[PDB]
């Protein structure tokens, strides 16, 4: 049983297609095995992306892993649509309901806007980076009509990084005409890293600021140096290194081959690689569902050109989106269920805040109960009324 | 994709057509590609892409223009995002600079067969501020609604 | 020291350090120089000789 699966990995993705690996072997059964065929192309672009789409489907797939950009996006959820092919990948959820697409990433809009209200927010600065879409943007500019804030967005994006310092200083300018204390950084792990050392230079990492990183990854980037500033900073963890599941995980990933597996000999990993490893376990129990349900649906490496006109979509695409889409088992990344969409469902994300001593989960959010703390202090500290 | 890969095999030397926010990338990308000429109407690019004739000018200055001709401080933003972000990107960054507070909200994503309570719950949270000076960014149709 | 006073954030406005050596543009000032905290220092290397 060999079911060939494309693979659309964007020039850089180490830690990701390491991840991708490790995934084929802990996953790999004898009742049926997967083959890989990567192609490590600019995700940016949508020329690109188009060929590499129909090249993995000329080579007749059933069904495809990868990554898109904000740019790139509309190629693969429409092409997919029509081609009723299944593209599973851990990039940001489409901003509506695209059919034949499986999503990683839990929408973090829940989570931020609850956070918000958590620290009681009504005045912050909003740093977005387009990378990801303005979907989370929308989000906070649209609740800041109800809940009434003056969120003061800013496209940290556009900024020409071969001279990137005199627009930095010209940034903290404007956060200074209504002293801006409380800031959002909705970035990639790079684009935060940049920002938090420009805070720490102007000083500005010191107590009566607070930062919240709006990713799902707070722990993958550098936070020992903003950690002993002050400044409170919070932010959202998808890899809970707490779970018995995670921790065997790295247990065996953190003594890996850093020659043979790149940026794979750490303790630690990027949500976007975790999500890649749990996407190879969702299309094996997709696949196993439909040996197991007696439902024929292979076929040869001659879907013919992708161009073909009219296209017509093969019917047996219909039952691999129905068997992705029933998958739940459980992951890296919590307990994964999907809706009749796509987007995840049932999951849950750990909000963390920074301390001294180090990051610190203070709570949970899930889609059904909101924001719940989790009493792991020791509080009644400094309370005790003095009776008169 | 197939109408500019059909027009593409047929042998053309130009290509007039138009483009939505998510096909536009497929246009600007294939005619760079390809060294296809493209002419449209449609919003012009955020950026500068080759091999693309953009027939409308950029009303983001125009806009922001006429904002300080008014002395606008305070004022709501309805927008669609059916051309683009780029005039809202535009008001936004401003309003950092000049000054401004700014009320954005999505009037796109109005869903239009039951689009009555949102437009109550719209003007609801427009009158929390007492907003009195909006501006429509949409098309000729979203515009008369 | 500069390193840690970065650190921990006291390198702000308010803060006053001088750097007692006759090398004074020998370190590296670059970290503790957009900080806001005023530091001083001596120089025997005259560059504008
Ligand atoms: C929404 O999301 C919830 C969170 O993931 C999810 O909760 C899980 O539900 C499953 C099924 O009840 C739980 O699985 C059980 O855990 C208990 C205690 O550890 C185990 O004893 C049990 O072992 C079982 O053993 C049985 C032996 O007779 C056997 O029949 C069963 O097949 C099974 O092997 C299960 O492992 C799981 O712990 C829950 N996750 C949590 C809370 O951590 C909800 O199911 C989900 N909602 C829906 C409706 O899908």
Same mark, same amino acid.
Request: glycine content about 4%; proline content about 3%.
């Given at each position: 049983n060999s079911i060939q699966i494309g693979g659309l990995f964007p020039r850089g993705a180490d830690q990701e297609y390491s991840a991708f690996r490790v995934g084929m072997v802990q996953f790999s059964t004898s009742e049926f095995r997967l083959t890989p065929h990567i192609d490590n192309l600019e995700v940016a672009n949508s020329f690109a992306v188009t060929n590499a789409f129909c090249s993995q489907f000329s080579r007749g797939v059933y069904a495809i892993f990868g990554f898109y950009d904000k740019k790139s996006v509309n190629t693969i959820t429409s092409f997919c649509g029509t081609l009723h092919v299944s593209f599973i990948t851990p990039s940001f959820?489409?901003?509506?309901?695209?059919?034949?697409?499986?999503?990683?990433?839990?929408?973090?809009?829940?989570?931020? #806007?609850?956070?918000? !209200? +958590?620290?009681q927010?009504?005045?912050?600065?909003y740093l977005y980076d387009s990378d990801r879409g303005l979907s989370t943007l929308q989000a906070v500019l649209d609740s800041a009509?109800?809940?009434?804030?003056?969120?003061?967005?800013?496209?940290?994006?556009?900024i020409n990084n071969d001279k990137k310092d005199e627009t930095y200083r010209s940034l903290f300018q404007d956060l200074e005409l209504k002293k801006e204390r409380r800031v959002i950084?909705?970035?990639?792990?790079?684009?935060?890293?940049?920002?938090?050392?420009?805070?720490?230079?102007?000083?500005?990492?010191?107590?009566?600021?607070?930062?919240?990183?709006?990713?799902?990854g707070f722990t993958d980037g550098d936070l020992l140096k903003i950690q002993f500033g002050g400044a409170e900073v919070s932010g959202?963890?998808?890899?809970?290194?707490?779970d018995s599941l995670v921790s065997?995980?790295?247990?065996?990933?953190?003594? #890996?081959?850093?020659? !043979? +597996?790149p940026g794979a000999h750490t303790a630690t990993i990027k949500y976007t690689s975790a999500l890649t490893y749990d996407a190879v376990q969702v299309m094996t129990e997709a696949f196993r569902n439909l040996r197991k349900q007696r439902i024929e649906i292979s076929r040869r490496g001659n879907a013919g050109d992708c161009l073909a006109n009219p296209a017509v979509p093969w019917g047996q695409g219909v039952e691999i989106e129905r068997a992705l889409k029933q998958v739940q088992v459980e992951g890296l990344s919590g307990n994964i269920k999907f809706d009749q969409n796509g987007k995840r469902i049932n999951?849950?994300?750990?909000?963390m805040e920074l301390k001294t001593n180090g990051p610190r989960k203070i709570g949970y959010w899930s889609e059904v109960d909101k924001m719940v703390l989790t009493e792991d202090d020791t509080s009644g500290l400094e309370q005790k009324t003095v009776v008169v």
């Open positions: 959820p489409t901003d509506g309901t695209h059919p034949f697409v499986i999503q990683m990433r839990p929408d973090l809009k829940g989570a931020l #806007l609850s956070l918000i !209200e +958590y620290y927010w009504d005045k912050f600065a009509a109800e809940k009434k804030w003056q969120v003061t967005a800013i496209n940290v994006g556009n950084l909705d970035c990639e792990r790079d684009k935060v890293n940049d920002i938090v050392d420009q805070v720490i230079t102007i000083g500005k990492h010191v107590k009566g600021y607070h930062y919240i990183i709006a990713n799902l959202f963890q998808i890899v809970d290194y707490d065997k995980f790295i247990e065996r990933w953190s003594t #890996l081959e850093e020659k !043979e +597996y999951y849950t994300i750990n909000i």
